A paper describes a structure:
Antibodies to PfRh5 can block merozoite invasion, suggesting that it is a potential vaccine candidate.
We determined the N-terminal amino acid sequence by mass spectrometry and re-expressed this region in insect cells to produce a highly stable module of PfRh5 that we denote PfRh5-C. The shape of PfRh5-C approximates an elliptical disk, the core consisting of nine mostly anti-parallel α-helices that encase a small β-hairpin located near the N-terminus. Helices α4, α5, α6, and α7 assemble as a triplet-helical coiled-coil domain running the length of the long axis of the molecule. On the opposite side to the α4/α5/α6/α7 coiled-coil domain, helices α1, α2a, and α3b assemble to form a short three-helix bundle and helices α2b and α3a assemble to form a short two-helix coiled-coil domain, these domains being approximately half the length of the α4/α5/α6/α7 coiled-coil domain. Electron density for residues 258–293 is absent, indicating partial disorder of this loop within the crystal structure. Comparison of the Rh5 structure in the bound and unbound state shows that there are no changes in the core structure on binding of receptor.
Residue numbers in the entry: 146 to 257, 294 to 513
The structure:
Amino acid sequence: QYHFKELSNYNIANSIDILQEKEGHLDFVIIPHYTFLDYYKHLSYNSIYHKSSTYGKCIAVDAFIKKINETYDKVKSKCNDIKNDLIATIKKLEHPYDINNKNDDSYRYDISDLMNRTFKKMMDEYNTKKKKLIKCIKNHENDFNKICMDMKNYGTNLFEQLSCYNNNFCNTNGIRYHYDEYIHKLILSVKSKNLNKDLSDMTNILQQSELLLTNLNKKMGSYIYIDTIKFIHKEMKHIFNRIEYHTKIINDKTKIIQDKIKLNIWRTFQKDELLKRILDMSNEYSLFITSDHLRQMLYNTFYSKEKHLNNIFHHLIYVLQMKFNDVPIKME
Ligand SMILES: *[C@@H]1O[C@H](CO)[C@@H](O)[C@H](O)[C@H]1NC(C)=O
């Protein structure tokens, strides 16, 4: 009858975050899955740390969690060839020609809200290649559910074995111990970070780079690197929107966990009340952990793209400096 975390009644494809921490690398996270696996991970430690006599069960729990991690990562690796095929296409869209020869002032008018015909051809491939990856993840859904259910069944079995000296006044040492050893470190790590300042700095990058794009678009327009910038800028906007979503959660859950933990330690509860509060803390930690994990990787992706974006603008420094209504080689 207890409120246990269930598998989403949502349409999977809408809850996937794509990460690109460095060049030549792409990965994905099915958000509900990560939250679900993390939820039951906390439920498992809370169940074995309740009684001072079951602390020794941690190695078995650690082994099982590591197994689930391997098994889950094995299913997601079934989409590797197809994911690698997407990476090759992104490589083409982001690097249409080499911009590394500083002793080369070459204007690529020869190639051919996008305009460039050759970029538009590479873009349609990207749309198909991306759509295929989502279909591959959607096609392996049941295999992902099977693993999620095995983690659910394990956590729930441990939780059913939780027992008190007197059901009228159950102890909360498990909640205290687990927090202190598994959660508290993460809370302090978040609290040492200025997440809102990170958002301000990203907002400025996006708005300032948009002005540089507006300038280039007016002078060049049809140039392949203009579409490349339009492509990187749009990706950076989605990335930022995701960081903003996760930051809101991180900030909320930091306050809630700190407040809720104070209401739960160094006191007793009737068994029923104890179990409901373990399920509720597990929910707060899973949501907080999922978002800090994603935020960190999305932050890395944003700056990986920004570094390239900055290199393209530096490559087009001559046109950026050029006078209003003055234009470089016009193309057709
Ligand atoms: C599960 O996730 C990753 C898999 O690479 C790993 O770094 C992490 O330590 C694993 N968690 C546990 C508790 O084994």
